[PDB]
């Protein structure tokens, strides 16, 4: 529905969705490649 | 709080005999000790159909489980 | 012959002694060994821990430079997309409502265009619409 | 060697003078 | 009604995490030698060190909420 | 000079919109010290603590405003 | 009511607030009723006389009490094994245990232990017996009397200076540079040559025989004939024992450099040539400004001539602005004094001048902390009184388009870029600290981000330190700078390369992090002070702040609320950041020097890269003996320090009550108490002369800040003294 | 007592007069605004300085200001 | 409460005056002065 679409696009939902995506990216990358202190 | 401060100063001045301590001027909670004694005697006559006290915090034996104390009198 | 107080971790007795007991960070049991072999390249102090040198030399460019460009690109991306989205919103007859309720189509459209932020930034600076004149900005009384 | 009683007493007597002068200065500044 | 639903979700979550990610079955056999534990940590950036040994070959966070004793008293 | 549907810049030197751009809502006859009425997009600080918004209109004299359009 | 006589607005106040504000505005001579400029300047002159006399009396009292109840004559026989004594203790409230605990340093009664490091100073300058100390105390009493009488005298109608006399900048600068600085330095050099050096070489010299004892075998002949090198021949050898004639040379002016082998301090002859040279330079400098002979520069033309096409009017009309504004001068003096005090601390912990003072670690730590805190206070005061100047004595038309008015033109840019640099420091510094803490806590301390302080180590190398192996400038023997035949190089290089002193201490990643944290603190405190000073004139929220004075409560809850909007409130906020920055500074210094003195630099080097090491290895570890000052089992000599530690921890908390709770609550409570007193029998016979009211908002902020600062200072002083005394004292 | 001053940007909206709880302000005919009325402060000796008049003023910055000065019993709002 | 310094009796009389006598004296004098309604 239109109202659900508008509610999903409010500021808190967007910022938390972006934060979850970024956190997932970082956690997965550190799962596969940990202990990266510098570019070798 | 002035009791605590007075004790602190007396201890700092090397005068432990002027403190509010059990080895010095004593402030004994006589009413609390009396009610503890009353509740310890409750299983006897005041609550005759009770086998033991409501809690051993008031007094009695030291209930210990395994190697640790479960509950003992709290003076 | 620089860093006479620093030694490579490969021949540092303290680092070598303490590197056989590295903890496994992840579920992979080889993470400790991988960290131990990867940290042997850097320079260790007497405490056995690696150190970073940021004097500007390119031999240690991995310590600061490569991450510096890596961070700066992303930060410029974020700032540029945010600024461009704000500027585009400013002409919609209700910018505040579109500031709390994000225009997701326009938002993602601006997201996908941020990889060219240095070229866009220099073009804006040359075109003169990147920076406003001091006479057009509100200022508090002196 | 350590000081004498007369030395301390003379120090007190000497310090009497700056007390009087400071009293006069404070009264003058109060005006 | 909404707050009741939230509390129900919390309680059901506690029971689920005590059923799947806990050593309650192991602790029940040896209650005096095994520490209660119902939170287990993913090893990602070294937080697997938090999964300390709680006895009986189980690694996890020791819990002090007392759910294990309540469950044993509940049959 | 200033009239309906205008775009002017403030030079009050103590107004909230000093250097800002406002629109001339209307002007009135003589005998008024500050006859020009100017409204602004941004609101000022006017209002009690915790107020949702402020005020986006004011009165100015003809010498305190410069034409932009 | 009479008090306060200088403000009729306060004198007609029926409440007790009149008693408070009367004290607060007492020494604010500018706002007094019926005050003229001439009277203002004369009263300030007399008050400055009074402060000088107070300083002299304080020094005299220190000398007298040390001579009377101290162990100066015993201390000089063994400076490395006998505790100096500050003053005797006479406390009827004491008990037997305290009397036994405080009978220390070989005394026969309860007594304190001096930590001001004045015994070393008196030993170095020459005085060795109690009679000399007593004579000094009496002479300082006489000096204080003379200055008090002078303050009285230049207040009489026949001696009150004119306003034109006060505004004479050129003559004041000439006299206070050639005379106050140069002549005093020359006299101190003469004292060192004629008395201090012979006394340190064993030859006793005093008022009785200084007229027949030549400081040098060749008297005034080489000096007058230009053969000055004679005075530098035969210096003190490395085997010289202070105060004796073993290994003592005859040179009175040398350039040995480095430190004395025995006292670990600078050579006295080096101090002599130093103060003599700076005396000559100051005397030359004091002949610059034109006073009465046509020759000499005039400050106004110099200021007005240094214009610029970029800054507009440059330094035009600044002479009038500075001369006619006492607050501008006070701010300049305070800033300079704060910078100089910081310099004194930094160059005095690393370059000790007094004999056997580097081995008394407690006094060194106390001196550094004391003078650094003084410098912080002065630096805050400079900005505060500069903001006062902007509020009161700044004339925009006179300073139109010059540097002073042009500062307010790009003040928004100033505050913006200063906010950016403060945020940039704080974010990425706290991030590194938290990263190291988290990674260490997870059992993997090898992933810590450790940045070597490359630039500071390069500077140390350029000054001659060869540990880092940079081989640059003075560390490079092939470079020209190390091949100039400077007389100080062989000694200075020996001193810096030794690891037994604080001269250019070795550094690591922890020092890098803590220096960047100190930079964050400095930039943030400067941000607060500068923003307050620039916005004191006015801002968007209050365009007419200048009409409301320097210190006012607020503008009410209207316009969104205006709590803490005055410049005084900006100073009030900046004081907390000053205290926090000083705390960081002193914690770093103290921990580093504890490691240095104990020889366990490894502890600091390992544990200073994460905050938990700061918490555990420094605070928790070094508090073990302090809190045990008095114990259920007994009392030791650290009991007073434990008591003062708790006292500070209490006053600090008490300040929170004024800082958090505000006026209306206490006002209503006082209403209730007033009703209770008025309705109580046998108490209505007594009534207050002044209606009791709650403390005002600004007064409350000031009182809370005062309690806070006192608790802060007392707590840190107690902890530092107790920890160092237990560890080494 | 405090000083209440009213400047020429007043538009005769009476908000300051209504917001005054101690009846310090008043309205007097004027000719500089449409309302032909301006605020006045004839009873400043009763003002306490609550700044409600300043809070109610709608003009840019304020056409009315309160400067807190000598504190009397009336100004300090003391009931004892 | 004895000391081995010269004229040990001085703190026996000086400290009380600085402790009790002088503080009370200036306390009362200042209290009288601040409530002196003679002038303004
Ligand atoms: C390289 C192969 C690989 C493998 C084997 C896995 C496997 C897993 N991921 Mg994963 N992931 C990967 C790549 C991979 N991922 C990449 C490249 C990303 C970046 C977008 C992610 C982002 C990601 C997130 C954000 C999450 C997982 C989660 C999970 C676990 C739940 C199952 C799942 O994927 O559905 C769930 C997958 C998602 C919700 C997002 C997947 C994004 C796709 C792959 C793109 C599972 C163990 C979830 C988990 O463990 O739950 C706590 C979880 O929250 N992953
Ligand atoms: C005072 C601060 C300071 C500053 C600002 C710099 C700045 C710089 N140093 Mg450096 N340096 C310093 C102190 C400083 N240094 C000190 C104290 C030492 C002695 C240890 C050195 C020793 C040093 C060496 C040995 C080298 C540098 C180099 C460089 C440059 C690297 C170029 C780069 O990465 O950009 C590249 C950017 C992009 C590709 C984008 C850079 C301009 C390098 C250089 O000269 O490069 C020309 C180099 O090899 N530095
Ligand atoms: C009941 C607590 C108590 C009391 C009353 C005292 C009292 C005293 N102690 Mg003491 N002490 C105590 C506990 C106490 N102690 C404890 C627990 C310890 C730790 C074991 C010590 C350790 C100790 C040491 C080590 C020493 C003392 C000393 C002293 C004496 C200092 C002389 C003095 O105050 O004049 C001076 C008065 C002042 C400096 C006033 C300062 C405070 C005021 C408020 C500041 C002034 C503010 C303002 C400008 C005032 C305006 C003017 C005013 C008149 C209105 C004094 C007799 C010293 C001593 O005997 O030498 C004389 C000393 O060396 N004490
Ligand atoms: C030779 C002439 C002469 C001399 C000696 C002085 C001296 C002084 N004048 Mg001055 N004055 C003069 C001519 C002179 N004046 C003339 C001609 C005029 C009119 C134009 C004035 C007008 C004038 C005014 C209007 C005032 C003074 C004041 C003062 C006093 C300020 C206190 C001070 O600076 O000392 C203390 C400071 C020093 C001695 C030097 C500062 C410290 C240096 C910079 C660094 C530290 C050195 C060293 C490391 C520290 C010691 C360490 C040791 C303790 C271990 C000082 C005694 C003030 C006052 O009221 O005093 C009564 C004042 O307000 N003067
Ligand atoms: C600035 C303070 C000061 C003062 C008051 C003195 C005072 C004195 N010094 Mg002395 N001295 C000083 C600084 C000072 N000195 C310094 C900085 C040095 C450099 C190391 C010396 C080096 C020195 C030597 C080497 C000798 C003295 C001697 C003397 C005594 C007599 C000679 C004299 O000075 O008449 C000066 C008379 C003149 C006519 C000089 C000309 C006028 C000038 C330019 C002013 C006299 C007590 C001599 C002594 O003990 O008795 C003979 C002696 O042998 N002094
Ligand atoms: C050379 C030094 C100097 C001089 C001459 C002045 C002079 C002046 N200052 Mg200034 N100031 C200075 C340094 C100086 N200041 C420093 C270093 C700071 C930073 C803290 C300030 C901060 C400052 C502010 C924030 C203000 C002034 C103001 C003023 C003016 C009048 C008010 C006043 O000072 O008296 C009145 C002073 C007081 C009432 C202070 C009493 C508080 C006491 C000293 C606290 C004591 C604590 C307690 C006793 C501890 C007990 C310890 C015990 C428990 C052991 C006056 C022109 C005021 C102004 O604008 O007037 C024009 C003003 O608002 N100054
Ligand atoms: C430890 C306490 C603390 C901290 C962290 C700060 C931090 C800050 N103060 Mg502050 N301040 C404090 C105590 C503190 N203050 C006290 C006691 C006073 C005395 C009243 C002041 C007085 C004061 C003044 C007067 C000013 C500041 C300013 C600043 C900022 C300067 C930037 C900086 O230093 O680092 C950068 C900031 C940080 C490192 C803090 C951010 C840390 C968090 C954890 C980052 C992550 C966000 C987090 C994940 C969000 C989660 C939310 C969610 C869980 C709900 C910053 C926000 C100045 C300012 O505004 O500068 C622009 C300024 O003008 N403060
Ligand atoms: C400011 C300097 C100073 C200070 C802080 C002290 C501190 C002390 N003295 Mg002391 N004294 C000093 C100078 C000083 N003395 C001088 C110059 C003399 C020579 C006259 C003496 C002679 C003296 C004697 C004979 C005795 C003390 C004693 C004491 C102790 C008891 C408290 C006291 O002072 O009252 C008693 C002492 C006095 C009243 C002496 C007078 C104080 C001087 C002369 C005036 C100082 C005025 C000062 C600058 C005012 C500052 C104003 C400020 C608050 C705004 C205490 C440790 C007593 C002691 O040892 O007990 C253990 C003791 O018996 N003092
Ligand atoms: C290690 C410390 C590094 C951080 C310290 C501060 C960083 C901030 C520096 C920003 C530059 C400020 C704008 C320069 C200010 C500016 O450009 O003014 C213009 C000025 C040119 O001066 P004029 O010749 O106009 O006149 C100078 C005087 O003779 C009188 O104006 O440029 C300089 O003097 C640059 C040096 C300023 C210092
Ligand atoms: C373009 C852009 C924007 C705006 C950007 C603007 C307006 C920027 C303005 C910048 C200004 C005015 C000034 C900048 C100054 C930069 C300086 C002084 C850089 C100094 C660099 C140094 C000192 C380098 C130091 C060493 C360099 C070397 C390579 C090694 O490491 C060692 C080491 C660390 C010593 C936003 C904010 C709108 C949005 C962004 O997304 C993009
Ligand atoms: S609130 Fe302001 S504009 Fe309205 S009548 Fe009062 S002073 Fe005039
Ligand atoms: S401050 Fe309060 S009492 Fe005074 S005029 Fe304004 S509204 Fe009335």
What do you see in this structure?
The structure is cut from a larger assembly and holds nine protein chains of eight kinds. Chain B has 75 residues and is α+β, with helices and mostly antiparallel strands. Chain B has three helices and two strands. In chain B, strands 1-2 form a two-stranded antiparallel ribbon. Chain B starts with a helix and ends with a strand. Chain C is mainly alpha-helical. Chain C is 49% helix and 4% strand. Chain C is built from six helices and three strands. The longest helix of chain C is centred in the middle third of the chain and has 29 residues, at 61-89. Chain F has strands spanning 8-10, 21-26, 36-39, 57-60, 65-67. Chain F has one domain (1-69). In chain F, strands 4-3-2-1-5 form a five-stranded antiparallel sheet, with no helix packed on it. Chain F has 69 residues and is an all-beta fold. Chain F is globular, with a radius of gyration of 12 Å. The C-G interface holds C 1-6, 18-19, 22-23, 25, 35, 39, 45-55, 138-142 and G 396, 405, 408-409, 411-412, 442-452, 454-455, 458, 467-471, 506, 508-509, 535, 537-540, 543, 602, 605-606. Bound molecules: chlorophyll A (8 copies), 1,2-dipalmitoyl-phosphatidyl-glycerole, ligand ZEX and iron/sulfur cluster (2 copies). The site of one chlorophyll A has 3 residues of chain A, from helix 2. Chain G: Belongs to the PsaA/PsaB family. Chain G: It is an enzyme of class 1 (oxidoreductase). Chain G: InterPro entries: PSI_PsaA/B, PSI_PsaA/B_CS, PSI_PsaA/B_sf, PSI_PsaB. Chain G: Its main location: membrane.
Number of domains of chain C: 1
CATH architecture of chain C: Orthogonal Bundle
CATH structural fold name of chain A: Single alpha-helices involved in coiled-coils or other helix-helix interfaces
Percent range for β-strand residues of chain A: under 5%
Hetero groups in this structure are: chlorophyll A, 1,2-dipalmitoyl-phosphatidyl-glycerole, the ligand CC1=C(/C=C/C(C)=C/C=C/C(C)=C\C=C\C=C(C)\C=C\C=C(C)\C=C\C2=C[C@H](C)[C@H](O)CC2(C)C)C(C)(C)C[C@@H](O)C1, iron/sulfur cluster
CATH topology of chain C: Helicase, Ruva Protein, domain 3
For this structure, what is the CATH class of chain A? Mainly Alpha
Query: Main sheet of chain C, how many strands, which sense, barrel?
Result: 3 strands, antiparallel
Count of discrete structural domains of chain A: 1
Multimeric state of these chains?
part of a larger assembly
PDB class: photosynthesis
Keywords: photosystem, assembly factor, membrane protein, photosynthesis
Entry title: RCII/PSI complex, class 3
Chain A: Photosystem I reaction center subunit IX
């Amino acid at each position: 529905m239109d109202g659900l679409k508008s509610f999903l696009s409010t500021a808190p939902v967007m910022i938390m969705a972006l934060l979850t995506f970024t956190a997932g990216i970082l956690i997965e990358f550190n799962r596969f490649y940990p202990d990266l202190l510098f570019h070798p | 709080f002035g009791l605590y401060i007075h004790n602190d100063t007396m201890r700092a001045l090397g005068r432990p005999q002027d403190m509010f301590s059990d080895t010095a001027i004593q402030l004994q909670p006589i009413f609390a000790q009396w009610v503890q004694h009353l509740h310890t005697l409750a299983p006897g006559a005041t609550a005759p159909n009770a086998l033991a006290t409501a809690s051993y915090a008031f007094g009695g034996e030291t209930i210990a489980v395994a190697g640790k104390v479960a509950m003992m009198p709290i003076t | 012959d620089d860093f006479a107080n620093l030694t490579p971790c490969s021949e540092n007795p303290a680092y070598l002694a303490k590197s056989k007991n590295f903890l496994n960070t992840t579920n992979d049991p080889n993470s400790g060994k991988i960290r131990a072999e990867r940290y042997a390249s850097a320079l260790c102090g007497p405490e056995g821990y690696p150190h970073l040198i940021v004097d500007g030399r390119f031999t240690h460019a991995g310590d600061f430079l490569i991450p510096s460009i890596l961070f700066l690109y992303i930060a410029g991306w974020i700032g540029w997309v945010g600024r461009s989205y704000l500027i585009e919103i400013r002409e919609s007859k209700n910018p505040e409502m579109q500031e709390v309720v994000i225009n997701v189509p326009l938002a993602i459209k601006k997201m996908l265009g941020g990889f060219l932020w240095p070229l866009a930034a220099v073009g804006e600076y040359t075109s003169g619409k990147l920076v406003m004149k001091d006479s057009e900005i509100p200022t508090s009384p002196r | 060697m350590a000081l004498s009683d007369t030395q301390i007493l003379a120090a007190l007597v000497v310090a009497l003078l700056p007390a009087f002068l400071a009293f006069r200065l404070s009264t003058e500044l109060y005006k | 009604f909404g707050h009741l639903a939230v509390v129900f979700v919390w309680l059901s979550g506690m029971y689920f995490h005590g059923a799947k990610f806990s050593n309650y079955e192991g602790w029940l056999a040896d209650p005096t030698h095994i520490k209660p534990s119902a939170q287990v940590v993913w090893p990602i950036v070294g937080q697997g060190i938090l999964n300390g040994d709680v006895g009986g070959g189980f690694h996890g966070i020791q819990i002090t909420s007392g759910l294990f004793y309540l469950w044993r008293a509940s049959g | 000079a200033l009239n309906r549907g205008d775009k002017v810049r403030i030079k009050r030197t103590e107004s909230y919109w000093y250097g800002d751009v406002g629109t001339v809502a209307s002007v009135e006859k003589s005998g008024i010290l500050y006859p020009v009425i100017v409204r602004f997009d941004r609101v000022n600080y006017n209002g009690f603590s915790g107020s949702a918004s402020g005020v986006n209109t004011n009165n100015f004299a003809e010498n305190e405003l410069e034409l932009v359009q | 009511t009479k008090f306060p006589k200088f403000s009729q607005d306060l004198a007609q106040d029926p409440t007790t607030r009149r008693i408070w504000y009367g004290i607060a505005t007492a020494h604010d001579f500018e706002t007094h009723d019926g005050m003229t400029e001439e009277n203002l300047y004369q009263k300030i002159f007399a008050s400055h006389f009074g402060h000088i006399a107070i300083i002299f009396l304080w020094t005299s009292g220190t000398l007298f009490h040390v001579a009377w109840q101290g162990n100066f004559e015993q201390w000089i026989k063994d400076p490395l094994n006998i505790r100096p004594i500050a003053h005797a203790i006479w406390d009827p409230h004491f008990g037997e245990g305290a009397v036994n605990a405080f009978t220390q340093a070989g005394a026969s009664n309860p007594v304190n232990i001096a930590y001001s490091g004045v015994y070393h100073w008196f030993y170095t300058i020459g005085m060795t017996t109690n009679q000399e100390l007593y004579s000094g105390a009496v002479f300082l009493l006489v000096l204080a009397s003379l200055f008090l009488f002078a303050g009285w005298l230049h207040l009489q109608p026949k001696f009150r200076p004119s306003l034109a006399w006060f505004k004479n900048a050129e003559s004041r600068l000439n006299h206070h540079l050639a005379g106050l600085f140069g002549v005093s330095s020359l006299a101190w050099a003469g004292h060192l040559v004629h008395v201090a050096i012979p006394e340190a070489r064993g030859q006793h010299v005093g008022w009785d025989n200084f007229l027949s004892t030549p400081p040098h075998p060749a008297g005034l002949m080489p000096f007058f004939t230009g053969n000055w090198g004679v005075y530098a021949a035969d210096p003190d050898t490395a085997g010289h024992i202070f105060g004796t004639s073993e290994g003592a040379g005859t040179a009175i002016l040398t350039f040995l450099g480095g430190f004395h082998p025995q006292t670990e301090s600078l050579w006295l002859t080096d101090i002599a040539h130093h103060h003599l040279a700076i005396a000559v330079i100051f005397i030359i400098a004091g002949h610059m400004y034109r006073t009465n002979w046509g020759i000499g520069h005039s400050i106004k033309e110099i200021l007005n001539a240094h214009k610029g096409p970029l800054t507009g009017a440059g330094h035009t009309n600044l002479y009038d602005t500075i001369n006619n504004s006492l607050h501008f001068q006070l701010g300049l003096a305070l800033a300079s004094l704060g910078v100089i005090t910081s310099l004194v601390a930094q160059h005095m912990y690393s370059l000790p001048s007094y004999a056997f003072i580097a081995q008394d670690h407690t006094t060194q730590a106390a001196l550094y902390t004391h003078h650094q805190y003084i410098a912080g206070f002065l630096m805050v005061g400079a900005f505060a009184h500069g903001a006062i100047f902007f509020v009161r004595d700044y004339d925009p038309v006179a300073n139109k388009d010059n540097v002073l008015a042009r500062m307010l033109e790009h003040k928004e840019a100033l505050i913006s870029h200063l906010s950016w640099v403060s945020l940039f420091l704080g974010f990425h510094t706290l991030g590194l600290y938290v990263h190291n803490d988290v990674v260490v806590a997870f059992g993997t301390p090898e992933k810590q981000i450790l940045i070597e302080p490359v630039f500071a180590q390069w500077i140390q190398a350029t000054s001659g330190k060869a540990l880092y192996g940079f081989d640059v400038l003075l560390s490079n023997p092939d470079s020209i700078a190390s091949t100039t035949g400077a007389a100080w190089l062989p000694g200075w290089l020996d001193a810096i390369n030794s690891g037994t002193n604080s001269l250019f201490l070795t550094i690591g990643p922890g020092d890098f992090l803590v220096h960047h944290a100190i930079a964050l603190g400095l930039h943030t405190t400067a941000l607060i002070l500068i923003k307050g000073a620039l916005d004191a004139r006015g801002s968007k929220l209050m365009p007419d702040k200048k009409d409301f004075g320097y210190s006012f409560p607020c503008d009410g809850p209207g316009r969104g609320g205006t709590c803490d909007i005055s410049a005084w409130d900006a100073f009030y906020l900046a004081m907390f950041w000053m205290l926090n920055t000083l705390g960081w500074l002193t914690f770093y210094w103290h921990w580093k020097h504890l490691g240095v003195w104990s020889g366990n630099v490894a502890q600091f080097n390992e544990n200073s890269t994460y905050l938990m090491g700061w918490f555990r290895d420094y605070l928790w570890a070094n508090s073990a003996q302090l809190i045990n000052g008095y114990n259920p089992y007994g009392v030791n000599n650290l009991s007073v320090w434990a008591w003062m530690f708790l006292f500070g921890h209490l006053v600090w908390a008490t300040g929170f009550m004024f800082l958090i709770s505000w006026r209306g609550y206490w006002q209503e409570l006082i209403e209730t108490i007033v009703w209770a007193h008025e309705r109580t029998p046998l108490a209505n016979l007594v009534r207050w002369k002044d209606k009791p009211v709650a403390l005002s908002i600004v007064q409350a902020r000031l009182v809370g800040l005062a309690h806070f600062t006192v608790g802060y200072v007392l707590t840190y002083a107690a902890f530092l003294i107790a920890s160092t005394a237990g560890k080494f004292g | 007592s405090h000083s209440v001053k009213i400047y020429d940007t007043c538009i005769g909206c009476t908000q300051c007069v209504r917001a005054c709880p101690l009846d310090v302000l008043e309205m007097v005919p004027w000719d500089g605004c449409k309302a032909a009325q301006i605020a006045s402060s004839p009873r400043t000796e009763d003002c306490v300085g609550c700044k409600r008049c300043e809070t109610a003023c709608p003009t840019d910055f304020l056409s009315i200001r309160v400067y807190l000065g000598a504190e009397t019993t009336r100004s300090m709002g003391l009931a004892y | 409460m004895d000391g081995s310094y010269a004229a040990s009796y001085l703190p026996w009389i000086l400290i009380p005056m600085v402790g009790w006598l002088f503080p009370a004296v200036t306390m009362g004098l200042l209290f009288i002065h601040i409530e002196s309604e003679g002038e303004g």
